[PDB]
Amino acid sequence: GPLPNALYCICRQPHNNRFMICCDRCEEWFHGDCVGISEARGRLLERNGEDYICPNCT
């Protein structure tokens, strides 16, 4: 699994136990609060199996 000091997202910062979502087009991980996805939306997207497309990829 990845090390705790790996970098992600548009912000180039670690996971830090923050809510994150993976882009199905570029495979990068994004902090929800960086890209506009609430935890609640994340819960729904995870359960409904729908793709997430990040801002870079839009």
């Binding site: 996971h15 923050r18 809510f19 993976c22 995870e46 729908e50």
Partner: peptide, 7 residues
């Protein structure tokens, strides 16, 4: 979508 939720 794949997510990580605060643990």
């Amino acid at each position: 979508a794949r997510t990580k939720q605060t643990a």
